[PDB]
C-alpha cells in the first residue's frame, strides 16, 4: 500500500509511451485514466465495504481501455462521441470482466462520473485540483507540467474517502472491528501472556 498519487504518477511512468499518440486529448484522458485507476484500487484496499470484492484490477485493462478508448477516440475529441456512454463501458467492459454485484457497478460508475470526459481543458476533481488544460504534454515527460504540481490533498486520517466517495463512519466501523480482531487475536496468545 502506497498513496493514491503514488499510484497515479508512478502509473504514468509505467504507461510512459501512451501519450506518444498524436491524440493530445488522448494523453489528457490517459492522465484521467490513471487518476481513475489509482482511486479504484484505493477502493479495493477497503474490500468488502469500499468495494465488495478483491477484483484483479490491472494495467493490462488500463491498456485495454486505451484501445477501447482509441476505438471511440477517432471522433471523441468532439461531440460526435457521447463519452458519457463511453464511460459506462470502459467500466463495464474494460474493468467489468468478472465484476459480479450491481453495487460495485454503481461504485465504479460514480468514480467514472468523477473522472472522465472526452474534451480536454476541463475540471474533473478540484479536490485533486484538476481544472487543467494540459494537452500536448506527456503523462511522464510532462507530468509536472500541471499534474505533479497538484499538491497533497490527502488527509492523514482520510484518503480522502471523499475522493473515493466513502464515509468516515465506515472507516470508524472498521476501526471498531479492528479492535475486536486484534483483541481476539491476543485471546489465544494471552493464554500464557
Amino acid at each position: 500500500i502506497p498513496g493514491i498519487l503514488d499510484t497515479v504518477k508512478d502509473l504514468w511512468g509505467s504507461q510512459f509511451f501512451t501519450g506518444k499518440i498524436s491524440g493530445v486529448w488522448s494523453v489528457y484522458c490517459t492522465f484521467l485514466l490513471s487518476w481513475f485507476h489509482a482511486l479504484i484500487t484505493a477502493r479495493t484496499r477497503l474490500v468488502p465495504h469500499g468495494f465488495s470484492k478483491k477484483y484483479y484490477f490491472n494495467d493490462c485493462d488500463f491498456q485495454f481501455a486505451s484501445v477501447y478508448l482509441e476505438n471511440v477516440l477517432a471522433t471523441n475529441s468532439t461531440n460526435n462521441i457521447p463519452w458519457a456512454q463511453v464511460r459506462d463501458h470502459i467500466a463495464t467492459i474494460v474493468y467489468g470482466g468478472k465484476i459480479d454485484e450491481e453495487k460495485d457497478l454503481e461504485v465504479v460508475a460514480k468514480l467514472c462520473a468523477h473522472v472522465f470526459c472526452g474534451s480536454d481543458n476541463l475540471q474533473i476533481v478540484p479536490g485533486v485540483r484538476i481544472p487543467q488544460p494540459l494537452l500536448q504534454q506527456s503523462e511522464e515527460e510532462e507530468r509536472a507540467r500541471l499534474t505533479a504540481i497538484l499538491s497533497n490533498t490527502i488527509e492523514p486520517a482520510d484518503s480522502l474517502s471523499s475522493w473515493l466517495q466513502l464515509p468516515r463512519e465506515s472507516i470508524l466501523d472498521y476501526e471498531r472491528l479492528q479492535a475486536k480482531e486484534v483483541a481476539s487475536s491476543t485471546e489465544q496468545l494471552l493464554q500464557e501472556m
Binding site: 485495454f64 484501445v67 477501447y68 482509441e70 476505438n71 471511440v72 477517432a74 460526435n80 462521441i81 457521447p82 456512454q85 463501458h89 463495464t92 467492459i93 467489468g96 470482466g97 468478472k98 465484476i99 459480479d100
Partner: protein, 1843 residues
C-alpha cells in the same frame, strides 16, 4: 516380425496390390514382396510369427523384407503423415483412417466415409457417377456447387477435398452475391433463399436493414423504417409455415434479427436517441457488405460499438438462432473484445442457461467452425495435440467445456502447449512448437475456455495460462424474453401473454413448492415445456390452456403430492380457466381391458398414472419409474405391454434386461484376436435382429427394452446413444442400426439420487406411490391366482370348489386388522402386504396340493375341515415364523379376532395341534427321542436330537419344499444353524440339498461351476431347461451366510442380484449361446443372521419381496435337558452303577450355561459368545473319556467333567478375576447337583489327567506330570527349539490341552496370546512330541494368494494323495488378504474349497486317485465316491489351527468376525505370563550363580518390600527386589500396563546374572591387587599412609559392594523398559525405583549415573571424539548399546546422528570382514566386504536393503553358519555389526518383533535447550572453572592408576 506382417497382412496386401501408393512406397511394397511373397505365400502355410520365422529361407526373407518392412512401416506412418501435412483435416482422422483413405484414395466415395472428421456443417455430398453436384448441410439445406467436382481416381483424396473446400465457399460467395444482387433491390428473400443458403442471405438481410435504418438514424425517418421492418416481417410471418421445415427455420432466423432491428428502431423512433452515436443503435450489431474485394471472404462486415470484424464464411448452413437478449449481445461484444487482444476465454456460467449455446452461436455469427471440446473426462491429450496440429494449420476454433477439470498431466501438458499456443498466437508465430514440432499456423484459430459456476468461484486456471485469458461473468439469460421471442416465432398468437404467465407459473411454482430434488425449473425446463406446447397447439390446445395442458403433461407426474395443491395454486393463480380435456379412448380401452385381463382392479390412479405413461410413450423415447416392482411398477409395465400390443395392433416385443446381471460386453459385444472377429452381444444382437427380423418381418411391431436397476453413472452412460433420444444404435465398431420409431426403453428403479439433474431430467419420470395397489386389488389378483394352480397332477376342480368355499373368508376378514397387528410385531427387515399374501397363498395351495391325493380321494367335507384348520395354521405361520417366538406368541393372540375360533386363550392353539392326511389331528405331544442315543454314534453329527418345534418346522418345511420356496432363516451359527438344517436335510434325499458357502468373496461363478459339475439341461421345446445331472432328485441349493458377502462401490448386493435373476427371474439368458434359460427341478433355500449385527448386509427389500423367513434363536433350559441330556444319556450307557448322573449332570451344565452366558458379556470382551453346542463339547470330551476307563465313580465323573468344563468356557475368556467368579459359578452349579464329591481339589486346582500315561480316568499330579516332561521334553526339544522359559503348572496345562486338540479329528482351533511367549514354541514342541508335518508360512511382500492357492492344492494332495499326517498352522503376520482368508474360510465351512481341485487337478486326481484305488484294492472309479474318499482322507490329516496376538488391525473379535468360524473353531485365550511363575523362572536363574556373597545380607533400603518372601539371603532379596522392580516398572498405561511383555526384565536379570561374576571378579581381582600393594608394604614400614589407604579401600568395598548391588538393580532399568516407556508408566518407577526397591536392608545412593558407574567413560569419550552427541543421557548411551546391545539397537536416524558417529567410528578402518557370505541379501553383503567398521550402511532402510524373512535368519540360520562350530547367526562382529541404520521410525516390524527389538533414539529436544542456554552463558564467563576441574579429574585418574 509377423505382427508387422499382420498389420501388413491387411496393409501390405492392400497397398502391395494397390500400385497407386507412392511408387517409392509401392516399389517398397514390392521389395517387401520380393521376400514377403514368402512371408505370406510361404506363410500361407506358416502364418504365425513363429511359423514366419521358420519359413524356407527366412534367413533372407525376413532380413530383407523386414528391412523394407521397417523402412515402410515407419515410412507408411510418415506417408500418411505426408498426407496429413498436405491436408490438415486429416489430423482429425486417425492414421488408420488414412490407411483406408489412401487405399481408397482413388475411390473418393469411400474416402467420404470420414467426411465429418474432414469438415464442418455438411450432412452429405450430393454427387452422382464420380462427380459432385452440390452438398447438403447438416441443417438440410443444400448448397449447389457451381462446378462439378470430378471424383476421378487421380485427383487424390487430398486435392479432391481441397477442391471442394474452394468450391463450396465459392458457390457460397458468388451465389450469395447473386442473392444479395436481388435482395439489395428489395427482392423478396423467399426467392433467393429458395435458391440459396440462408446464412449468407441473413448477412444481406442484416445489411439491408443496417443500411436502411441509417435514414431513420439521420432522424429523417423513424416509423418509415420501423413500419417497413414490420411490413417485411408481416410478410415473413405469413410465409413461416411447416410446409418447409428447413425454410421455416431460415425465416425464424431472419425474423429474430428483424425483431432486433425493430426493437432498436422502436426506440430510435420512441427516443431522442443521439443519432447513430446513441448506444441504442451504436452498440447494435450491424452488417455491411460489398462485392469489391480481392478475397471473397471479406464481403461482409460485422460491427458494434467501436468494433469491426470480417465474417469467415465457413459453410455452416443455418446452425443456431439463439434468442438474443441485451445481455447475450453484450456478452458477444465482450467476446469480440477478447478476440482483439488475442486472449482466450473464461466463460462463467452453466450450459443450458448459456455457456455452450452462446459460444457456439457466437462462433457461427463470426462464420468459423469451432471444435467444442468436452474437457471433463479421461482423454488422451496427445490426440488433442494431433487435432491441434490440424487446427492450427487450419485456423479452426476450439472451446473447452469445463477446461479446468483436468488431472495434473493433461492440465500441465496443455499448460505448456497452450502457453505456447497463446504465446505464438500473440507473437503471430507461423510455426509453433506443438509437441516440440514447428506446426504451421493459420492465424484464425482460437481458444475458448468456458466454465459453469466455478468451484467456489475460483480461477481454477493456473496463472501460467490465466495471464492470456479474459473474464466473462455470465449472470443470467433473459428467460421470459427468450420465451416470448420464441413464442412470437412459434406463431403462437398469444405469445406475450403466454410468456408473462409462463415465467410466473414457474416463479410461483419454485417459490412455495417442496424439495423435489429431482426437479429443476431452469431455462431449459422452460424450453422443454414449450417443446411440448408446440404439438399441443397443433392438437387444438386452447391458447393459454395449451400452456397448462403442457404443464399437466410434463413435470407434475414426476412431482409428488408434497406439492399437490401447492402447485395447483402456484400455477392456477396464473391461469385459472386452465387445461383441455383428455379423451384417450381407444388408448384407455386397450389399457383398461388389459387391466381387466390381468386382474388389476383398474383403479383410478392406476389408470391415471398409466395414461400419463401413455403420453410419455408417445412423446418420450424412454421413461423412468421410481417405485416398487410387482406393485404398479411392473404391474403397469405389464399392462402397457398388453395395451400397446392391442392399441397399436403391434405386438409389444419387449426385451427385459436386468442391467447389472450382464456386463456391457455381454450386452453389446466383444472380440476374438486369434483369427480377428467381433462378437455380438445380446442387446446388439437384439437390435440388429430388430432390423434383420423383428421389424425385418414385423415392420411395425412395438419393440421394447427394459433396464431393471438403480442409478449410477457407470451403468447408465453406456446407453446414451439410444436411450437419451437418438434411438439409433451407433456402435464404436461402426455398426449403426437406426432403431425403429416403435422402439422404446423403460428404466425401472426405486432411487435415482446418485448423480446430477443434468442427466436425470432427460426422460419421462413417474413419482410412483405404492398405494396404486389397493389391498382389494391385491386380493382380486390372489383370487385369480387360484385358477393358476398348481402341479400337473391338479386339475383344480376341487380347488375351484374350495375357492368358492374360502372366498367367504375374504369378506372383511379380521386380517384387515391382523395385518396391522402383524406389522406391529417386532422384526428386523421390512414387512409388506404383497409378500404377506404371497407366502400365505403359496403354502396354502401346496397344502392343497396334498388335498389332490390325501383329500381329493376323501370327500369335500374332509377338504373343508382340514383346509380350514390347516390354512388357519399356515396363515398364522406365514405371519409369525420369521420373528422371535415370544412375539409369535403375542401374534397368535390375534386368533381372538376371528369370530369362529375367537380365542387368544387357546392352550393347544391351532399351531399346537397338527393335522393328518386321514382327516385326523391332535395336539403335538412330545415325542423327543426318549430311549435313543445310547452308544457308538454319540459323536456322529446327524444324531442331533430333533424336538417338537423343529418337527413343526419340518411339517411346514415339507410343504414349503412342496412349494418350491427358498425359506431364509434368521439366527446364528451354533444355535442349531447347521443342526436343524441337517435335521431338515436328512429328512428327504429326494431333494438334493447343496450347501453353498457365502463368504465375503464368494461369486456367482463359484455357484455356476458347482452347477456345471452337478447339473445338465433338457429342452422339452427349444426353451433350455436346467436339470440336475440326474433327473427325479430336486436340487435344493442352499444359501448359508446370505448377509455376509461384500457389496460393490454403491453398496449393491450383486450376489443377491444374481441370486434374484436366478430366483426372481427364474433362470438366465445364455449370453454364450444367446438363449433364455428356464429351470426344471432346481430349488433353493437360504439363511442368514440378524442384519443388525456388525458387517451384515441391510438386505434388499425387493429381494425379500418374495422370500419366506424363519427366526432361529437359542434353546431353553428344559430343552437343553431334553437334548443334551440325551447326549449325556448315551454317555452313561457305559457305566450303569454310576449311570445315575442322568439328569443332574445334564442340568448342571444347563444352568451353568444359562448363567455363564449371562456372566460374560461382550461388553466385558467382544468374543465372549455362548452356545448350547458347548454342552455338546462336554458330551464329546466326556464320552471319549468314558471310553478309556473302567468305572466312573462320581468323584471321577465330575473331576473329568469339571476340569473339561472350564477348558470349554474359561479358556476362551480374558478377565482373570471374572474367571474366578466363574469358578464359583461352576463350583456352585455342580455344588447344586453333585456336591457330595471332592469339589475342593477339583475346582481349586488346575489339575491335569494322564496323557503321557494312558488316561484311564487317572489324575496325575501336575508336579509328576511335569516330572514326566522334564525328561520327555529334553528329547523332543532336540536342541532345536532354542527357548528356555520354565514350564509352570500352566505351561504343562497348555501342553495337555494342545495335545488333546492335536489328537482330535477336525483339529480346528484359535489360540489368542502374547507374541512368541511360548504359545508358539508350544506348538513346535508338540510337533516333536506327536510327529506331524507342520505347515508354517514364510511371507515376504512380493507374494500373493495364487502362491497360497498353490499351497492349498499342494496341501490337499499332501494329505490325500501323498497320504501324509500333518497340521496346518496359521501365522497372522503372513495374512496377505481377505480372499486369501476366504479360501480357508470355505475350506473349513464345508470341509472344502469347491472346485479348487477342478479341471486338470480333478482329472489328475481321477488318474492318480484311481492309481491309488488300484493300489488300495478299491473299485472307486465312481468319481463321486472317489473324491468323497479324497476329501475324507484330507479331513483326517489337515487340522487347521490359527494362532493370534492382538496388537494390530485384526478385527476386534481377534478374527474377522465369521459367525461360521465362530460355531466351529475351538478357542483358547493364552494371554500373558503370571508374576509368580516369572519369579519361578528368576529363581531358577539365580540358582545357577553365586548371588549369595556373604558381604551382602539383605541389600536395598530406600522403600518397597511389602508382602515379599521373608528376605534373608541375596537370592531371596534379588528375586523379590526384581519382583517389585518390574511389577511397579511398570504400572499405569503410558505404553499400556494392561498388556506387555516380560522379556524386558527377564534378560535384565540375565545381564545382572552375568554381572554377579563380572563385577565380582572386578572386585576380587582388585582385592588381589591391593594385597599385592600390601605385600612388600607390610614389611616396607616406612610410611603408613599408603598401607592404611589400602586397608581403607577394603573397608570401603566391604560395605560398598552391598551398597552397590542396591544401586545396581536400579542400573538395569535403562535396559529393562526405560528406553521406550514414557512418563505415565516410566515414572511409576523412574526415580521411584531408587525410592522403592528398598526396605531389604542396604543403602540407596541417591545418585544413579550409570553412564559412569557401569562403564569406563573412555569408550564413550572415543565415541564423543567420533561425533557422539553427549546431550541426552540415553542419547549418548546409545553408543554403548551400539557396543553391547543384543536385541538389535535399531538405529533410527532421521537425525542421521549415527551416520556421523559411525563414519568417525569408522575412521581409518574399512567397511566389513569375517563371516563373508551373501545368503539371500547380496545387496548388503557386497556393499560391505572391505575389512573393518560398518553398520547397515547409512539411512539404509530394511525394505530396500533386506527381505522380510531375515527376521528368523538374522536371529539364526543353518543355511549360513555350520554346526561344526554350533553357531547359526553369522560372524558380523561389533565394529561391523550390521545395525539397521535406517531413517524410518515406522520401519516394518511385526507385532512379535516389536517386542524382539531394541528401538534406538537419536534426536535432540526442548529439555536440553535451557541448559544449552545456560551452558553457553555459564561457560562464556566460567569455562575456566570447568577447565580447572576437568584437568583435575584427569589427574585424579592418573593417581588412581598410580595406586
Amino acid at each position: 516380425v509377423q505382427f508387422y506382417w499382420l498389420d501388413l497382412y491387411g496393409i501390405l496386401g492392400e497397398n502391395l496390390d494397390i500400385q497407386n501408393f507412392l511408387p517409392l512406397e509401392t516399389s517398397k511394397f514390392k521389395s517387401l514382396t520380393s521376400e514377403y511373397k514368402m512371408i505370406t505365400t510361404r506363410a500361407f502355410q506358416l502364418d504365425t510369427t513363429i511359423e514366419v520365422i521358420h519359413i524356407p529361407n527366412f534367413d533372407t526373407t525376413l532380413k530383407l523384407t523386414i528391412d523394407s518392412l521397417k523402412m515402410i512401416k515407419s515410412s507408411l506412418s510418415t506417408f500418411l503423415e505426408r498426407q496429413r501435412r498436405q491436408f490438415p483435416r486429416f489430423y482429425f482422422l486417425g492414421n488408420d483412417d488414412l490407411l483406408k483413405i489412401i487405399g481408397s484414395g482413388k475411390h473418393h466415395d469411400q474416402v467420404s466415409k470420414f467426411m465429418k472428421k474432414m469438415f464442418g456443417s455438411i450432412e452429405s455430398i450430393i454427387f452422382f457417377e464420380d462427380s459432385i453436384t452440390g452438398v447438403r448441410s447438416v441443417e438440410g439445406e443444400v448448397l449447389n456447387l457451381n462446378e462439378k467436382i470430378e471424383l476421378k481416381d487421380s485427383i487424390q483424396a487430398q486435392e479432391w477435398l481441397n477442391i471442394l473446400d474452394t468450391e463450396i465457399k465459392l458457390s457460397v460467395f458468388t451465389q450469395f452475391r447473386d442473392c444479395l444482387g436481388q435482395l439489395k433491390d428489395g427482392t423478396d428473400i423467399e426467392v433467393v433463399v429458395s435458391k440459396y443458403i440462408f446464412q449468407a442471405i441473413l448477412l444481406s438481410a442484416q445489411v439491408m436493414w443496417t443500411e436502411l435504418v441509417e435514414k431513420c438514424l439521420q432522424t429523417n425517418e423513424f416509423s418509415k423504417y420501423w413500419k417497413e421492418v414490420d411490413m417485411k416481417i408481416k410478410g415473413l410471418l405469413d410465409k413461416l409455415n411447416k410446409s418447409s421445415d428447413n425454410v421455416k427455420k431460415k425465416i425464424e432466423a431472419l425474423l429474430v434479427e428483424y425483431l432486433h432491428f425493430n426493437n432498436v428502431i422502436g426506440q430510435l423512433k420512441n427516443c431522442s436517441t443521439k443519432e447513430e452515436a446513441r448506444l441504442l443503435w451504436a452498440k447494435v450489431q450491424k452488417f455491411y457488405q460489398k462485392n469489391d474485394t480481392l478475397d471473397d471472404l471479406n464481403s461482409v462486415f460485422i460491427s458494434q460499438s467501436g468494433y469491426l470484424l470480417q465474417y469467415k464464411f465457413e459453410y455452416i448452413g443455418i446452425p443456431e438462432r439463439l434468442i438474443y437478449t441485451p445481455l447475450l449481445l453484450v456478452g458477444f461484444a465482450t467476446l469480440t473484445d477478447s478476440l482483439h487482444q488475442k486472449y482466450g476465454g473464461c466463460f462463467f456460467g452453466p450450459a443450458g442457461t448459456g455457456k455452450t449455446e452462446t459460444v457456439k452461436a457466437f462462433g457461427q455469427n463470426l462464420g468459423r467452425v469451432v471444435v467444442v471440446f468436452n474437457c471433463d473426462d479421461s482423454f488422451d491429450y496427445q490426440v488433442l495435440s494431433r487435432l491441434l496440429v490440424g487446427i492450427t494449420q487450419i485456423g479452426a476454433w476450439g472451446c473447452f467445456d469445463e477446461f479446468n477439470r483436468l488431472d495434473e498431466k493433461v492440465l500441465s501438458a496443455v499448460s505448456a502447449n497452450i502457453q505456447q499456443i497463446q504465446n505464438g498466437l500473440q507473437v503471430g508465430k507461423s510455426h509453433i512448437t506443438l509437441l516440440e514440432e514447428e506446426t504451421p499456423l493459420s492465424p484464425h484459430t482460437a481458444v475458448f475456455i468456458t466454465l459453469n459456476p466455478g468451484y467456489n468461484g475460483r480461477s481454477e486456471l493456473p496463472e501460467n495460462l490465466k495471464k492470456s485469458f479474459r473474464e466473462f461473468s455470465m449472470k443470467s439469460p433473459q428467460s421470459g424474453t427468450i420465451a416470448e421471442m420464441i413464442l412470437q416465432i412459434m406463431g403462437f398468437e398469444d405469445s406475450k401473454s403466454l410468456a408473462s404467465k409462463i415465467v410466473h407459473f414457474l416463479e410461483l411454482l419454485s417459490s412455495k413448492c417442496s424439495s423435489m430434488n429431482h426437479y429443476h425449473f431452469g431455462l431449459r425446463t422452460l424450453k422443454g415445456v414449450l417443446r411440448n406446447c408446440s404439438p399441443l397447439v397443433s392438437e387444438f390446445g386452447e391458447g393459454e390452456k395449451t400452456v397448462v395442458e403442457s404443464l399437466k403433461r410434463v413435470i407434475l407426474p414426476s412431482l409428488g403430492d408434497t406439492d399437490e395443491l401447492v402447485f395447483k395454486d402456484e400455477l392456477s393463480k396464473i391461469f385459472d380457466s386452465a387445461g383441455t380435456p383428455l379423451n384417450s379412448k381407444a388408448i384407455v380401452q386397450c389399457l383398461k381391458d388389459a387391466g381387466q385381463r390381468s386382474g388389476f382392479s383398474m383403479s383410478e390412479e392406476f389408470l391415471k398414472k398409466c395414461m400419463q405413461f401413455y403420453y410419455m410413450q408417445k412423446t418420450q423415447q424412454a421413461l423412468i419409474l421410481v417405485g416398487k416392482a410387482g406393485c404398479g411398477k411392473t404391474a403397469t409395465w405389464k399392462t402397457v405391454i398388453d395395451a400397446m400390443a392391442i392399441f397399436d395392433g403391434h405386438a409389444n416385443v419387449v426385451y427385459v434386461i436386468d442391467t447389472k446381471v450382464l456386463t456391457k460386453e455381454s450386452l453389446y459385444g466383444s472380440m476374438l484376436k486369434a483369427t480377428l472377429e467381433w462378437r455380438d452381444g445380446l442387446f446388439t444382437s437384439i437390435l440388429r435382429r430388430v432390423n434383420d427380423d423383428i421389424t425385418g418381418t414385423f415392420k411395425n411391431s412395438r419393440i421394447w427394452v427394459v433396464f431393471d436397476s438403480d442409478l449410477d453413472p457407470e451403468y447408465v452412460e453406456a446407453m446414451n446413444s439410444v436411450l437419451d433420444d437418438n434411438k439409433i444404435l451407433t456402435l464404436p465398431n461402426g455398426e449403426r442400426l437406426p432403431i425403429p420409431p416403435n422402439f422404446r426403453i423403460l428404466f425401472e428403479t426405486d432411487n435415482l439420487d446418485h448423480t446430477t439433474p443434468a442427466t436425470i431430467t432427460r426422460c419421462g419420470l413417474l413419482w410412483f406411490s405404492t398405494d396404486v395397489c389397493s389391498i382389494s386389488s391385491k386380493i382380486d389378483h390372489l383370487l385369480n391366482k387360484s385358477y393358476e394352480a398348481l402341479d400337473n397332477k391338479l386339475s383344480m376342480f376341487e380347488l375351484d370348489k374350495l375357492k368358492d368355499l374360502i372366498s367367504d373368508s375374504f369378506d372383511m376378514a379380521s386380517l384387515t386388522n391382523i395385518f396391522t397387528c402383524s406389522n406391529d410385531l417386532v422384526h428386523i427387515l421390512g414387512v409388506r402386504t404383497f409378500n404377506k399374501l404371497e407366502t400365505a397363498v403359496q403354502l396354502a395351495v401346496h397344502l392343497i396340493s396334498s388335498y389332490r391325493q390325501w383329500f381329493q380321494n376323501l370327500d369335500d367335507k374332509s377338504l373343508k375341515d382340514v383346509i380350514t384348520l390347516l390354512i388357519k395354521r399356515s396363515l398364522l405361520y406365514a405371519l409369525a415364523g420369521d420373528s422371535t417366538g415370544e412375539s409369535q406368541r403375542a401374534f397368535i393372540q390375534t386368533i381372538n379376532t376371528y369370530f369362529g375360533h375367537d380365542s387368544q386363550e387357546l392352550s393347544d392353539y391351532s399351531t399346537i395341534v397338527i393335522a393328518n392326511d386321514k382327516l385326523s389331528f391332535s395336539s403335538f405331544c412330545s415325542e423327543i427321542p426318549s430311549v435313543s442315543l445310547e452308544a457308538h454314534e454319540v459323536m456322529r453329527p446327524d444324531i442331533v436330537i430333533p424336538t417338537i418345534d423343529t418337527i413343526k418346522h419340518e411339517k411346514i418345511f415339507y410343504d414349503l419344499l412342496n412349494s418350491k420356496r427358498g425359506i431364509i432363516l434368521c439366527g446364528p451359527p451354533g444355535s442349531g444353524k447347521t443342526m436343524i438344517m441337517n435335521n431338515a436335510l436328512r429328512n428327504s434325499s429326494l431333494y438334493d440339498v447343496v450347501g453353498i458357502n457365502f463368504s465375503k468373496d464368494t461369486t456367482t461363478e463359484h455357484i455356476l461351476s458347482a452347477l456345471h459339475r452337478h447339473t445338465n439341461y433338457v429342452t422339452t421345446s427349444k426353451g433350455l431347461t436346467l436339470l440336475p445331472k440326474s433327473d427325479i432328485k430336486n436340487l435344493v441349493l442352499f444359501c448359508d451366510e446370505i448377509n455376509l458377502p461384500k457389496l460393490d462401490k454403491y453398496g449393491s448386493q450383486n450376489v443377491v442380484l444374481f441370486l434374484r435373476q436366478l430366483m426372481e427371474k427364474q433362470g438366465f439368458w445364455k449370453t454364450p449361446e444367446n438363449k433364455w434359460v428356464t429351470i426344471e427341478r432346481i430349488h433353493i433355500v437360504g439363511a442368514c443372521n440378524p442384519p443388525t449385527d456388525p458387517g451384515r448386509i441391510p438386505m434388499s427389500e425387493r429381494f425379500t419381496r418374495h422370500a419366506a423367513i424363519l427366526y432361529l434363536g437359542y434353546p431353553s433350559g428344559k430343552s437343553l435337558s431334553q437334548i443334551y441330556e440325551i447326549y449325556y444319556k448315551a454317555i452313561f450307557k457305559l457305566v450303569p452303577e454310576f449311570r445315575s448322573y442322568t439328569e443332574p449332570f445334564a442340568r448342571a451344565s444347563v444352568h451353568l450355561y444359562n448363567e455363564c452366558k449371562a456372566r460374560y458379556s461382550t461388553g466385558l470382551q467382544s468374543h465372549y459368545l455362548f452356545s448350547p453346542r458347548e454342552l455338546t463339547r462336554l458330551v464329546r470330551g466326556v464320552y471319549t473319556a468314558i471310553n478309556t476307563g473302567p468305572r466312573q465313580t462320581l468323584r471321577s465323573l465330575i473331576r473329568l467333567w469339571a476340569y473339561e468344563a472350564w477348558r470349554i468356557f474359561a479358556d476362551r475368556l480374558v478377565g482373570v478375576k471374572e474367571k474366578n467368579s466363574f469358578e464359583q459359578l461352576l463350583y456352585e452349579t455342580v455344588d447344586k447337583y453333585l456336591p457330595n464329591q471332592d469339589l475342593g481339589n477339583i475346582s481349586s486346582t488346575s489339575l491335569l489327567f494322564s496323557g503321557l500315561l494312558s488316561l484311564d480316568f487317572k489324575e496325575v499330579n501336575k508336579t509328576d506330570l511335569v516330572n514326566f516332561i522334564e525328561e520327555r521334553f529334553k528329547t523332543f526339544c532336540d536342541e532345536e527349539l532354542e527357548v528356555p522359559m520354565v514350564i509352570h503348572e500352566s505351561m504343562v496345562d497348555h501342553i495337555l490341552r494342545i495335545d488333546r486338540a492335536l489328537k482330535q479329528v477336525q483339529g480346528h482351533m484359535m489360540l489368542i496370546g502374547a507374541s512368541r511367549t511360548g504359545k508358539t514354541i508350544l506348538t513346535r514342541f508338540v510337533a516333536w512330541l506327536n510327529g506331524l508335518k507342520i505347515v508354517q508360512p514364510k511371507i515376504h511382500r512380493h507374494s500373493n494368494l495364487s502362491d497360497f492357492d498353490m499351497i492349498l492344492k499342494k496341501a490337499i494332495s499332501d494329505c490325500s494323495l501323498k497320504e501324509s499326517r500333518t497340521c496346518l498352522i496359521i501365522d497372522e503376520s503372513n495374512i496377505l488378504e481377505t480372499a486369501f482368508l476366504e479360501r480357508m474360510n470355505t475350506l473349513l465351512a464345508n470341509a472344502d474349497i469347491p472346485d479348487l481341485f477342478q479341471g486338470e487337478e480333478y482329472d489328475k486326481l481321477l488318474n492318480n486317485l484311481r492309481n491309488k484305488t488300484r493300489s488300495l484294492g478299491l473299485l472307486l472309479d465312481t468319481e463321486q465316491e472317489l473324491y468323497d474318499w479324497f476329501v475324507g482322507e484330507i479331513a483326517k490329516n489337515l487340522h487347521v489351527v490359527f494362532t493370534i496376538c492382538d496388537p494390530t488391525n485384526n478385527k476386534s473379535s481377534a478374527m474377522i468376525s465369521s459367525p461360521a468360524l465362530f460355531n466351529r473353531c475351538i478357542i483358547n485365550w493364552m494371554g500373558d505370563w503370571d508374576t509368580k511363575t516369572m519369579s519361578q523362572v528368576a529363581n531358577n536363574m539365580v540358582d545357577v550363580v553365586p548371588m549369595e556373597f556373604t558381604d551382602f545380607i539383605v541389600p536395598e533400603v530406600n522403600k518397597e518390600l511389602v508382602f515379599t518372601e521373608p528376605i534373608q539371603t541375596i537370592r531371596d532379596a534379588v528375586v523379590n527386589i526384581l519382583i517389585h522392580f518390574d511389577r511397579n516398572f511398570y504400572q499405569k498405561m503410558k505404553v499400556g500396563v494392561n498388556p506387555r511383555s516380560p522379556g524386558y526384565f527377564i534378560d535384565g536379570l540375565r545381564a545382572l546374572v552375568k554381572l554377579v561374576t563380572a563385577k565380582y571378579q572386578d572386585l576380587q581381582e582388585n582385592q588381589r591387587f591391593v594385597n599385592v600393594g600390601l605385600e612388600k608394604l607390610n614389611e616396607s614400614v616406612s610410611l603408613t599412609f599408603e598401607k592404611e589407604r589400602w586397608l581403607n579401600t577394603t573397608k570401603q568395598f566391604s560395605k560398598t559392594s552391598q551398597e552397590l548391588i542396591g544401586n545396581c538393580i536400579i542400573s538395569s532399568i535403562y535396559e529393562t523398559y526405560f528406553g521406550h516407556l514414557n512418563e505415565r508408566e516410566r515414572g511409576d518407577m523412574l526415580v521411584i525405583l531408587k525410592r522403592l526397591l528398598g526396605k531389604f536392608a542396604v543403602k540407596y545412593d541417591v545418585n544413579y549415573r550409570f553412564i559412569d558407574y557401569l562403564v569406563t567413560l573412555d569408550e564413550k569419550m572415543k565415541w564423543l571424539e567420533c561425533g557422539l552427541d553427549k546431550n541426552d543421557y540415553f542419547l549418548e548411551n546409545m553408543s554403548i548399546v551400539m557396543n553391547s546391545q543384543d536385541a538389535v539397537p535399531f538405529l533410527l536416524d532421521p537425525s542421521s546422528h549415527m551416520i556421523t558417529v559411525i563414519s568417525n567410528y569408522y575412521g581409518n578402518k574399512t567397511v566389513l570382514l569375517s563371516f563373508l557370505e551373501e545368503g539371500f541379501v547380496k545387496r548388503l553383503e557386497n556393499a560391505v566386504r572391505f575389512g573393518s567398521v560398518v553398520i547397515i550402511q547409512d539411512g539404509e532402510f530394511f525394505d530396500p536393503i533386506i527381505s522380510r524373512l531375515i527376521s528368523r535368519e538374522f536371529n539364526h540360520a543353518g543355511n549360513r553358519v555350520t554346526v561344526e562350530i554350533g553357531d547359526h547367526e553369522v560372524d558380523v562382529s561389533g565394529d561391523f555389526k550390521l545395525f539397521i541404520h535406517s531413517c524410518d521410525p515406522s520401519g516394518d516390524i511385526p507385532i512379535f518383533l516389536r517386542s524382539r527389538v531394541r528401538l534406538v533414539h537419536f534426536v535432540t529436544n526442548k529439555e536440553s535447550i535451557e541448559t544449552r542456554i545456560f551452558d553457553i552463558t555459564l561457560t562464556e564467563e566460567n569455562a575456566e572453572m570447568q577447565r580447572k576441574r576437568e584437568d583435575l579429574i584427569k589427574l585424579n585418574t592418573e593417581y588412581r592408576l598410580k595406586l
